[PDB]
Amino acid sequence: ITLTENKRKSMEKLSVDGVISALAFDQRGALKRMMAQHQTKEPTVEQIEELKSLVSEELTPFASSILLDPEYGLPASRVRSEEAGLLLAYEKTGYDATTTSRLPDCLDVWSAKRIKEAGAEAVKFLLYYDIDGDQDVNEQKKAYIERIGSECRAEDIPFYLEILTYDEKIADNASPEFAKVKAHKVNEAMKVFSKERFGVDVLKVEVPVNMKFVEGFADGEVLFTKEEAAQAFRDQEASTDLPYIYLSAGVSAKLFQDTLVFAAESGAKFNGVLCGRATWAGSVKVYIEEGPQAAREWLRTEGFKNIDELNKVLDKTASPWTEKM
């Protein structure tokens, strides 16, 4: 539903047996903030590019594909395992914090055609979306996604749409107040962007619940029973017929793995993950303070353990996207 020959071939290069076990490292401003916590000077371009190349070289042998940004990640893309596919990010990093609109914007000197010419098997785009937000803002966001979806249809390259939800009136998405509305924000946004007019091939989405407030997982206030959390996962599955994959949102590797198990037990038929920080977060401190060689040894030990255990979990929880397309 309903891949062209070329789009199918690219999807196969990004997955194994219909499951996407992709490594995500297109973070730019978020990576800079992480490195800023560990050194005096400002993170330089050589540091950004080198660290991306280390993660790509050491960990892509254990992923079906890697997501990188064209601004700092092109060197890293050339050192990935020959068995791993490539996704390239298309959006500018971050958003304007002085306003609530968080309007999307493509990299200035890039296009879907140039992403394909750079060797990518997919275009990835991040959209911030408040389903309950200003209707004129959301009309502009939907028109923008339509353009990108049309680009990808013309270039015949899969369109991976990442949706991060928020509320114009809630400052912290980690708060209990946002947790109470998160399922609504996520599942209704997925329903909108599963419409044919947007040309999405795979949705990259948050889990529809903040697991730190679910019974059995919560260390403090409990907002949801397990059955209530399970129902949010079943609503998410009932919100789209497209393939969708989960992002880690920077939670610990263990919590993300436990969440995937819970998702599968609840009835969610997710088709993999695009997991970033939960895998390689710890390499940042080591690289900045210890250097590149020490970072390699971290990736070969702690990094491998994160992605290896994730792969074991994906093997028993994820469903193949070939059942949907």
Ligand X SMILES: O=C[C@H](O)COP(=O)(O)O
Does 93 engage in binding with Ca ion (CB under 5 A)? no
- Residue 28, contacted partner among ligand X, ligand G3P, Ca ion, none, CB below 5-8 A by kind: ligand X
Count of beta carbons in the 10 Å neighbourhood of residue 299: 23
# residues contacting ligand G3P (CB under 6 A): 14
Cβ within 8 Å of residue 129, ≥6 positions away: 138, 141, 163, 164, 165, 166, 185, 189, 192, 193
- Residue 248, contacted partner among ligand X, ligand G3P, its own copies, none, CB below 5-8 A by kind: ligand G3P
Touching Ca ion, residues 279-318 (CB under 5 A): 311
- Residue 3, contacted partner among ligand G3P, ligand X, its own copies, none, CB below 5-8 A by kind: none
Q: Which stretch binds its own copies (CB under 8 A): 68-76, 139-147, 167-175, 178-186?
A: 139-147
Q: Name which position in 29, 250, 265, 315 contacts ligand G3P (CB under 6 A).
A: 250
Contact, 138 vs 129, CB < 8 A?
yes
Q: How far is CA 306 from CA 61, 247, 257, 278, in A?
A: 14, 15, 9, 8
Q: Name which position in 11, 23, 67, 245 contacts ligand G3P (CB under 6 A).
A: 67
Cα separation, 258 vs 159, in Å, equals: 28
Helices (H), 173-303: 176-193, 226-237, 253-266, 277-290, 292-298
Q: How far is CA 185 from CA 201, 277, 281, in A?
A: 20, 23, 27
Does 277 engage in binding with ligand G3P (CB under 6 A)? yes
Does 174 engage in binding with ligand X (CB under 6 A)? no
Touching Ca ion, residues 210-239 (CB under 5 A): 237
Touching ligand X, residues 73-112 (CB under 6 A): 93-94
Does 248 engage in binding with ligand X (CB under 6 A)? no
Supply the minimum distance, in Å, between the C-beta of residue 274 and ligand X: 12
Position of tokens 């529809």?
Answer: 208
What stretch of H or E contains 275? strand 272-275
- Residue 249, contacted partner among ligand X, ligand G3P, Ca ion, none, CB below 5-8 A by kind: ligand G3P
Cα separation, 157 vs 119, in Å, equals: 11
Q: Which stretch binds its own copies (CB under 8 A): 29-37, 43-51, 136-144, 169-177?
A: 136-144
Please give the single-letter amino acid code of residue 19: V
Tell me which residues touch ligand X (CB under 6 A): 27-31, 93-94
